Every structure is written in structure tokens, then in C-alpha cells.
Design a protein around this nucleic acid. Sequence first.
RNA 1: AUUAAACCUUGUACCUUUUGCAUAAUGAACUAACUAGAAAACUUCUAACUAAAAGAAUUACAGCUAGAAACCCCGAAACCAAAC
RNA 2: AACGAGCUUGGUGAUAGCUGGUUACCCAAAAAUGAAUUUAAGUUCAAUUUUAAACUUGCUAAAAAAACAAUCAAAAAGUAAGUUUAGAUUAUAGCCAAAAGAGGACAGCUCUUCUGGAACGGAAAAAACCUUUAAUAGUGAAUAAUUAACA
RNA 3: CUCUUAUCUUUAAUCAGUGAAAUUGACCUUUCAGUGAAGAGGCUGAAAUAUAAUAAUAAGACGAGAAGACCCUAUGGAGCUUAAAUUAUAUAACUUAUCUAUUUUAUAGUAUAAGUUUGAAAUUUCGGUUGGGGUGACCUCGGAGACUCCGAAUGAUUAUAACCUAGACUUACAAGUCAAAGUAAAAAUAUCUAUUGACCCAGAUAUUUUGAUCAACGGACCAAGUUACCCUAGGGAUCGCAAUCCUAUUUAAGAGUUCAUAUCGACAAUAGGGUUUAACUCGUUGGAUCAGGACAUCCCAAUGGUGUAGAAGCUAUUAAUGGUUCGUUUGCAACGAUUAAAGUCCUACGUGAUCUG
Lengths: 245, 325, 100
Amino acid sequence: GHKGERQRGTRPRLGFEGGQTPFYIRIPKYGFNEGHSFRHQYQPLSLRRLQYLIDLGRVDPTQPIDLTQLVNGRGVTIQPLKRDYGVQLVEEGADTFQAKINIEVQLASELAIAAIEKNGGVVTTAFYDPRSLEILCKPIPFFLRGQPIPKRMLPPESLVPYYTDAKNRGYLADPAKFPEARLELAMKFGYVLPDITKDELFRMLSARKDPRQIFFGLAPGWVVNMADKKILKPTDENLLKYYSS
Amino acid sequence: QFTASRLALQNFDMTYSVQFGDLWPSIRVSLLSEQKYGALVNNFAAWDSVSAKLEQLSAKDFVSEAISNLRCFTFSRGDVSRFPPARLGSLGLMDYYLMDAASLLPVLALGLQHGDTVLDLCAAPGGKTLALLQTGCCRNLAANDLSTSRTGRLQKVLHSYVPQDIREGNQVRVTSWDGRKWGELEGDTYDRVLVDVPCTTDRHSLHEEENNIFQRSRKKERQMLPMLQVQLLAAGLLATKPGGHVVYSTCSLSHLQNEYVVQGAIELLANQYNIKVQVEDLSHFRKLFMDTFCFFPSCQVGELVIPNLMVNFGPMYFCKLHRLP
Amino acid sequence: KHYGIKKMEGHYVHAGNILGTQRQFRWHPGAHVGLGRNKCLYALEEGIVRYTKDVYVPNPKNTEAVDLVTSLPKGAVLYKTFVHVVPAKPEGTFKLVDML
RNA sequence: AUUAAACCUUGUACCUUUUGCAUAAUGAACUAACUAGAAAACUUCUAACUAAAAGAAUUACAGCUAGAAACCCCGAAACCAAAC
RNA sequence: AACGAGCUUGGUGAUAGCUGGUUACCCAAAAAUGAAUUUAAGUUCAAUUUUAAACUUGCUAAAAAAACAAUCAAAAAGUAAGUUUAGAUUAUAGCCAAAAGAGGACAGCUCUUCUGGAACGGAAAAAACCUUUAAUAGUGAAUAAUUAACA
RNA sequence: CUCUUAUCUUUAAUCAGUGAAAUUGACCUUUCAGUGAAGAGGCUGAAAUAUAAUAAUAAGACGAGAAGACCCUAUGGAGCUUAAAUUAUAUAACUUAUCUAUUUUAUAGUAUAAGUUUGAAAUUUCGGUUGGGGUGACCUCGGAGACUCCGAAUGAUUAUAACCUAGACUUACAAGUCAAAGUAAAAAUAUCUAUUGACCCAGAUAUUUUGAUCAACGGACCAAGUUACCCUAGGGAUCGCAAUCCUAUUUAAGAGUUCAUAUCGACAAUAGGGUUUAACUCGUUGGAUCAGGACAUCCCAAUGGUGUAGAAGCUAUUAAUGGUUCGUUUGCAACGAUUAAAGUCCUACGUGAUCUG
Ligand SMILES: [Mg+2]
Ligand SMILES: [Mg+2]
Ligand SMILES: [Mg+2]
Ligand SMILES: [Mg+2]
Ligand SMILES: [Mg+2]
Ligand SMILES: [Mg+2]
Ligand SMILES: [Mg+2]
Ligand SMILES: [Mg+2]
Ligand SMILES: [Mg+2]
Ligand SMILES: [Mg+2]
Ligand SMILES: [Mg+2]
Ligand SMILES: [Mg+2]
Ligand SMILES: [Mg+2]
Ligand SMILES: [Mg+2]
Ligand SMILES: [Mg+2]
Ligand SMILES: [Mg+2]
Ligand SMILES: [Mg+2]
Ligand SMILES: [Mg+2]
Ligand SMILES: [Mg+2]
Ligand SMILES: [Mg+2]
Ligand SMILES: [Mg+2]
Ligand SMILES: [Mg+2]
Ligand SMILES: [Mg+2]
Ligand SMILES: [Mg+2]
Ligand SMILES: [Mg+2]
Ligand SMILES: [Mg+2]
Ligand SMILES: [Mg+2]
């Protein structure tokens, strides 16, 4: 253009409206985004994606399902660094869901539970803390680090009611109250509870990891040596006390 | 450089001091000193209550001594006591109105009589209206004032004191129109007319910087005040009915604004409109009010209330004129 | 401010459309046209605005209007300009929800 | 144009600049060399794979990855530190 | 060897809404109005303009009838544009003629509103008035304004 | 100086040697009238006109050089002044402490810290609109008139005025307007007139609310003068009405008038000049030298008329031919003596690359 400020290359900053109070500064501050960096994120999983994954052989329904086997089959993508705390099952696709599977997901829903239970499956909810989740999504590198497997901390006070509640199928919930809660849900959605015990794969379905276990078959405090193909367990009494806790 | 108050004091020293001479010292300090306020009763339901309460305060109605329909309680001679702030009555009407005792003389002088129609040109919230309303037992009235905001509060004052039923009656009429133009509107309409022309307000001018006539910008208005006063006084003379009585009131001590204006106006009416005015003497009225008011007899016409240290109720210059034809 | 007739004759008018804004009662409300406190006129039903002049009969209660009407001579009849909105839609239709 | 270099006909230097006008006002004696537009948030275009893309951490209710595509020069009066 | 406060180096490529400058061809489209601002030698937004994409009515005109030569606008017709979405600036001082108000229910003068123009042809003068749809070669041609007036 | 001259040196000019500077778009570089921006070697219309040098003049080339002058602008500076704003272990002081002496609490001091009081200083600033200046002022909102006027940062009345939610007005943004339905209190709109202030940040309470003559009113949390001692970056220039009063011409209501004997003039009309009637200081040029032109003629010359006897005049026309003084007071205005007359004007004070106040 002609000679002037914008042509000299020295025009003001963005949001500067000539000298009147700018639009972005003259609006009241509100807490839309307050505490955003500490809010919990659960990468949702729908039942269409679950059934679709099972159909194509990218999830093994016969084996127990967990966050590791969802990530391994690329069914879900998880970013621990971005406050992801796990996967929440979602009600979308319940009607098409006709699969019996033992799925562990940090958050569950009423209707999502119905789809799993009606077809004769086990649904459980377990809390993984930020350190535990990173190892669960990405196991191999942790074994390469050489550090011992860590314990899994219990949920903080805010989440304690949820994971101790029978209706939510919490891992810490009382085993005795499960039957009644399942039956009430069964009546609500108009299906008859199937007898899992009679089912041949009762042991697999019923399988549940210890509340202090990140992986079903590995106890806290062990060390995995991939190069030698061995597992090392501490013999020290002091360390065993700490890990057993 | 000079404040309006400084200029106002300068004018009195060069002019007013000469007129009064040896009396000027006491008057000069009187104006600088705080003014004395006299409480005026609202009558109505609080008619008895205020009178009993004011007696407890030791204030005495100067009007009552004069008699021995307006009673205004005032403190004793040389008493500096301050009246308590006005308070609302049980009915919702203010118990009393604080005002300068001298300001009530023009109303008492106008000889209000029952079954009369009264005009109050440029009345403003000077208090004479409210006082006159209390006198207006059976008297239709009328109010006028050039400004609006000045007139706006005047209605508020009427709301506080005057009961709604009385105000609702046509008797109470509020308008804001030019006084000189008003003369043509209603000629020979009001038996009694009280005309309080805008004056230099010497007491207010010295104390108050706001809206002071002595400001340099307002030079034009100050010089033309005598001409405007004559026209307004002439307008009232036109409006008053045959045989009517009119009172012309000026706050200022100026000889030019007080005596020449009234006599000059009488001459103007006699020449242009061929009308005659009968002068009236209030010397007897002065004698009754000597205790509560002090006057000086130098003025050929009018009864000016000089502010005195013992009785600081001035300044009020009021002259009563009766329309002969 | 910017007082005028927003909706001219023949214009489709939705429920809440404001026909016009007036400082004083230049246009009086008509059928299916509500009157706002600020004296603006708003439609009430979908329709086509049509302006007509009709005899104005004031409510008995207000004194000023009644006195003025009486002051008029017997022969004379006053008129005012009104804004009307003729409904252009059927309020409802009947459909068979189910056969039982 | 012309047979003919000049005569005859036509024609108010250049840039910047003022309003979109100069007979103005700035700048240039001439030659050689040197002497001033630079960044990828959003968009467009082109491909790879595709509910997935990316050679670790990223984004996704057709996306994702890579490529190409962009924003000058000269000049104060001054201010501070430390030497002289 | 020019002290309202020495000089040298460094900070330092100080900063400059200001002045000056900013290097090949070709084709195409293309405007100094409103608002705020320590603002009126600036910037930001609206409006305008532009490149692409989406799909459908748009411009002139627009009878009756309103609200009073306009604000609005239906069938038509002459004709090809208009709306929405994504990206992006510069611009924000006009110049002159001719119309109409409005300032002292004046002319003028200062404003405001509408219209037009930016020759190589014409009008002693000649960017602004009048004739003139772009630009190309030809030793073709018909023409416009005008080339004063003979009262 | 009237009034200038003569001789000599220097410089100049010529022959010989040596060899700068500012400046320079290109130039084959004319006159007059016209046009134009106080403007023309170059454009328009006439005219003039072989080519080059040497030496002179300074009219033009808005001639060339300088850190000179002038008015205005910059959210550019710097010096000074403080009644500007913010600070201020310069100093001095005192107070409580720390701390060492001492006496039973006490008065002493103080390698320190925390305050209070002065301020030697440091830092930073100079809002906008008013044809310049001091004084007035005005800066936002709305009502009325077509810029002239009125108001406001609302008060009174209020048996107290919910929530939620279609569609719209207005509008750069921000702000500001109206509202069906649904739902809820109660037994539907508070009442006029009209009324503004963002974000940040501080206050309040048991979850709801309050903070601006921020009035320069889109609002910097908080900053005045002054410069002729100045500086830089640039831009500039170099008509109306009225109200009386005077007058002039035409009116003349009137009176008038009286042997080289008369008119004036009410009232009007019309041209001028004042006054009242509407905020509180001012903006190149004499002289010397040489002059060019205009005529609206001052003198010379040629004439008409005359209330022109002769002699002085007065009025008028034609004519631009040559001429058109010397001083004193000295800031131009007077004056004194003369002359046939001591013209009026234009030529950017006509003319400072000719000189000067
Ligand atoms: Mg501001
Ligand atoms: Mg993710
Ligand atoms: Mg040059
Ligand atoms: Mg620079
Ligand atoms: Mg415009
Ligand atoms: Mg500015
Ligand atoms: Mg600027
Ligand atoms: Mg020579
Ligand atoms: Mg030689
Ligand atoms: Mg030659
Ligand atoms: Mg030649
Ligand atoms: Mg020439
Ligand atoms: Mg010429
Ligand atoms: Mg020529
Ligand atoms: Mg010359
Ligand atoms: Mg500074
Ligand atoms: Mg908004
Ligand atoms: Mg409703
Ligand atoms: Mg401001
Ligand atoms: Mg402002
Ligand atoms: Mg505004
Ligand atoms: Mg000096
Ligand atoms: Mg000095
Ligand atoms: Mg001559
Ligand atoms: Mg002649
Ligand atoms: Mg002399
Ligand atoms: Mg010269």
C-alpha cells in the first residue's frame, strides 16, 4: 500500500482495536476452563466398535479383556499424558451386540451393562491411577526400563463411592451384593439372567485381577527379563511386606 | 482569579457600604455569619403536635406575639440554637418547614383573604408557596417559574406537605412559563399576586460559588436585572384584578433593585396603560414585628429587613401595592 | 429511534415479528397483534399484514377518553388506523395416530 | 516521412508526489560495480494410508501424514555503562 | 576548532504512526462512506472488493393497497446473474461540472443529497464540459461533437 | 555632498608556465499577447531569425550556497522551575527494639533493624475542540426547533412485579429494546417523566450482592509549568431584522414671500453614517541608481461654454509630447523657501546575484 504504519511493517498487535478497550479484555472472566488440566478423561468405547473389533479377529473374546488388549488390537487409542484415565463403555450399539465377553473398563453405564449381561458376559469396573495406566497401555517399555512392577493405588476419595458400589460393578464392591443388583437390572430391561456358572468357561469369565495388580498374572515387585526369558521375584522379607500391602 | 464570592463582596463594599454607611459594619458581618432558621408548622394532623414540641424547644412564635393563619416558631432573641431537622408526620406529611422568618413577611403582608385567586410568579421552591398554601384555606392559587428543574422540586415540596386532595383541586396549579409573557395570558385574573423577582441573592452569592450572579460570564444578566425586574413587576400589575393587592419582594439590599424598580414600574403603568397605583404604608406592621425584626426607615418605599447579629433573619425587601382601578 | 413500519403490506409475518415501533400511538394494535409496554406492535400469529381504519371506541373506565368521545357532535364519528395480521396457517390438522 | 542529413507535419522530460491536474514541489552531471519481502496458526493445491493416520508422547463423529505455497531497505534528536 | 552540558567504545541492526527508496514479461478483475480510538500524518470493525466452492433464483421493471416521490412490490416481460460458505487484504483526505435542499421558509458562501466525467476528436485557454463499447495491420470508407454570429 | 575629476599602485586585459570551487535531468537553450497556481526559453496564436568566438552589464532562469526566520504536527526529545505525580538508608534528627555500661527500676550511649519527620536529589509527564493569544469555556446521554433552547447522571408513588422460553427490533463491536407459549406465586402490567460507566481489582454475606463529576463520560491504578538557550523528524507558508438619530436627492403639509431682493420647509419616500439591538486581543518597507508603461492631464500646447467687459478665474472636451525642485524638524507626517508645474497611479518596497536604513 501507501506510506503508513502497516506499510512500515510496524502495525500494532492482534486484538488491538485502535485504543478503545479491546473485545477480548472487556468481557467478564468466567470459569469455563478452570481446572481443565486436572479433569479426568475416559476415551469412550461403544458396543459397535467392540462388536466390530471382535468380528474381525482383532480382539480375542475367549480370553479376558483389559485395557492392554484393547490397545494391542488398536481398538482404542489412549494418551496418559493428556489426562486419560481409561475407557468408558457406551450404550451406542447395544442392540447389535450379541457377544459374551469379560470386559474390564474403568467406567460403565447402566444400559451398556445390560448388553454384556444379557448375552451372558461379565462387566467389571476398575480404577487405574496415572502411573498404573501408563504401564497398562504400554507394558513392554516398562519391562525394558528394568524397574520392578509397581503397586496400584486405590481410588482417591472422590471416586471411592463409585468403585465400591455394587450397581456400578466396582472391583472393590462387595461380592455378596452382585447377585441382587444383576437381577434388578435383568427385570428392568426384560431379560432373564443367564447362569454363568453352568457355562463351560466359568473360570475365565469369573477371572478378576487382584486390586493391587496391573496385570492379571504378574504380582507387584517382580522383574521381567525379556533377554533371558525369565521372571525375577525378590526374596527379601522387607520388600515382600511393602509389595504385599 | 477572583472567585464570584470575592467579586460579590467587592460590589457591596463600593456601593452598599455608601448607601448604609455606619450600619454597613454590622450588616457585613451578619451576612458572613450563619443565617438563622425559623421552623414553619405544616398544620394538618401535626398542627397541635408541632406546637407542643416547639414549646419544649423554647422556640416562640413571633406571629403569636404580634397578634397579642400562619404560625412560625422561632428561637429567642440572641439565641444561636439550631432547630432539629424536619421529620415526617404520622400521616406522611413533613411536620415543619425550615425557612427564614423574613421570607414569611411578604406572605403575611399580602393580606390574604378567603375566596381569592392568587398567582405566584417565579415562586420557585422559596417556601412562600407552602406558607401561602397553608394560608389558602379558601383561595384558588397558581404557581409559575421560568426554569423546570427549579420547578421540579417545587412539586416535590408540595407532595411532602400539601395533602393530595387539596392539591388535586384546581386550587393548586403548577406551570413553568415566562412571567412577562404570562401577563398577557390572564389579565385582571388574580386578586392577590406575590412577585418574587430573581435577585442577586447577596447572602447566597457570598456563601455559594455555584450559580452565582457575580460570575464574570453572567455579567450580561446582572446589569440587565433592573430591566427584567420592572417587566416582571409590570406583568403582575397587568394580571391583578381591579382593586387588587400585589406584593413585590427582593432579597438584595440594592437601592437600585428595590425602590427605583417599584416606583419606575408604577410610572410605566401610568403612562403606557393609564393605570394608577395606591401606595400602602406598613409602619404599623413594623411596630408589631420590632421584637423579631429590625428595619431601617431610610427607604422611601418598601420595608426592608436588615440582617442583624441579634436578629439575623435578613435580608428581605417587600413592598405592597394596591391597584387603584 | 428509527421508528417506522418494519413490515409493509403483503409481507409474511411470523409469530414474534415486530410490525413497527412508534413513539406515540400513530398505529393502533389490530386483531392478533399484541401491544408492548414500550408501545411497539408485535404479531401473535403467522399472517399477512393489512392496514385498515376502523371506528375507535374507548374503554368506559378511562375518564379522558370518554369525555373526548362525548364532546364529539352526534353526527361526527372518529376513526383510527389499525394494523392487522390475517392468520395464514391452520391451527391444527387431524391424523390417524394408530388403528386399535 | 522523403529522391534528399537539416527545411515540411505531429508532439507541454523522467520518477516520486500531491485528488484520479501540473508550466508545480522533491531526487538525478555521466559510466562501471554493489544496493531493499524473511517465518506456515487458519486456508488452497498435490499425493500416501484410511476409522484410522504418524518411525514413542499427536490428532480424529473422514480423518491423518507428507510436499509445495508468507509477511523489506536507509536515516534522527536522544538514553545508560565504562574508559579517555 | 558548534557544550542548555565533553568525547571514544559498548548496549545497538536503539526507536521512529515521520521523509526517502524498494530491480523481468504477459493476461485479467479492481474503492477517500458508517463507528470507536491521547483519535483526526495511525489503527481496528462494518461496508465495499476479490479468489475458490455450494445451489437457485437475481437485476431492470415491479398493477392494484397500503405507511405517505420516494419506503414497500405480482403476475408478466427484457435479460444473467443473485444468495450462502471458506480465505484475504488495501482503503478510511478527493477533484470539477450539473441538479435539490439547509444554514442567515435567501442568493451567494460552508455544508448535505442525487447524477456524470477522467481522448488521439472538438470548445482562444482545455485532467472535470460535449462527441467516443476494448486493441490490432492496411497509401480503404461512411460518420459524431465542432469548425461563431448576421441577428 | 552640490559635482565630479586627475595621476600612481593594485587588479584587470594580452604572451608564457601551472592549475581549483560551488554548480550541472537532458537541451538544437529567442520576442509579444493569451492561458495558468501573484507564475511561460519549451504549451496556444502571431512575429523575428546565416554560423561561431573575445570583452562588458546583472533583467530573468520562482539563479546557487548556510546548522537562519515564520505558523502547525509528533501519545519525538532535552534544559530550567517548582504549588505536578511517584519515590527518596544525601543529610540531619528523634521513637521502640538490639546491645555495653552502670544503679533498683533508672538514666546513659549504639558497626543494626522497624517506624515517624523534614528533603540534597533521582524518575517520568505535558488530553481534545474552539481562523493565533490571554480569559471564558465546552468533551457523555436524551427532549424540542431548524445549528438555537431544556434537562440527567433520576426522584416520588408504589399492598412489590417470579422463573423459563418461540420469534424479532437495534447495532461495527460492546451495550440497549419488545415478547407468545410453558411454569409459579397470588386473586394479568410498579407509576409517570427520561436516563447510561466495560474489564481488572478491591469489598461484603451464608450465595446472593455492592464499589466512579473513571463527567477527557469506550474509562491509562497514580504525573503541572517553561524555553528568545533550545533540538530532531516532517508538513505549511515564504448578507441578515428591528429601535431611534443624523445626514443626501426627490415629496411639500405648510407657511411663504416683495424695484441689481426669499424662499425655507411638516410629512413621506428613497440612498449613506452611527447608535441601541448578542461570549472575554491583531493581521512587509523607506532611500540611492536606472527607470518601462497607463491617462483617470499636474505643467507646456489646441479649444467649447460662462452668472467670460479688461484683468484673475471657474466648468468642460481633445491631446501622453517633454518636463514634473531644494531643504528643515524624522518617523513618515508637518514646516520654509521657490517653480511654468512641484500630476494620480502600475511595473511582486518596479529594481537587495547593483548598494543601503
Ligand atoms: Mg481512551
Ligand atoms: Mg485419545
Ligand atoms: Mg540534482
Ligand atoms: Mg529503521
Ligand atoms: Mg460515501
Ligand atoms: Mg492522536
Ligand atoms: Mg496517526
Ligand atoms: Mg578574462
Ligand atoms: Mg595563461
Ligand atoms: Mg548551435
Ligand atoms: Mg538556436
Ligand atoms: Mg519571452
Ligand atoms: Mg508571458
Ligand atoms: Mg510560443
Ligand atoms: Mg540576471
Ligand atoms: Mg521517556
Ligand atoms: Mg453486541
Ligand atoms: Mg406466556
Ligand atoms: Mg479521552
Ligand atoms: Mg470518548
Ligand atoms: Mg457512543
Ligand atoms: Mg533574551
Ligand atoms: Mg540567557
Ligand atoms: Mg520613465
Ligand atoms: Mg483624455
Ligand atoms: Mg537630504
Ligand atoms: Mg533582484
